Symmetry: C2
Subunit: 112 residues, 2 copies
């Protein structure tokens, strides 16, 4: 009877975020983690994937889907190596950070 | 705070995967089945009287609820009986095998989260 409380608000958040932003709660968790890794500088993709797999317990393919979606929705940025084509970095620019803050202020208020 | 909700996101997603793999049930199905235990453990309940209750208690659409109820019945975790007089009228109920399945399932949930 204490689990249902959690379930209602979780389901409620998931629908709200989906409707308003077309993001899943996986995308949010991934985006949250990007803030801890590439706020000030860029980070290599293959690296971020291992960190994220361990910390979020998501498959590599679920992570790639989320990262690609965040980039597509202009909430995360990507830069390739001029040296090695197969090497990709992700990073948050200033627009991305301002979007991030707006999004999570919106998250906190929906929950509170 | 945010470590506790990201924390809870992990356990939540972990539970959903486990239940889906092992039972082919969603967490919606679980919430609905939990609610059935509070309404039709000892007697049957009219489908209408249940959909409204559940809609209010679980904040789910009538259609999401019909999907779950139908799935629970197909998975032999919930039972259904029709009126003989009005074909339109349907009841749901938990029989003794259903209750036994219910207990096994929730014991499994409770231990997975601990």
């Amino acid at each position: 009877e204490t689990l249902l409380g959690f379930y209602k608000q979780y389901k409620a958040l998931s629908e709200y975020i989906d409707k308003k932003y077309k993001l899943s709660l996986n995308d949010l968790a991934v985006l949250d983690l990007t803030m801890k890794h590439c706020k000030d500088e860029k980070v290599l993709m293959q690296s971020f994937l291992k960190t994220a797999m361990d910390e979020l317990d998501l498959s590599r393919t679920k992570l790639l889907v989320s990262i690609r979606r965040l980039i597509e929705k202009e909430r995360l940025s990507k830069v390739r190596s001029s040296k090695d084509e197969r090497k990709i970095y992700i990073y948050l620019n200033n627009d991305d950070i301002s979007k991030f803050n707006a999004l999570f202020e919106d998250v906190e208020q929906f929950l509170n």
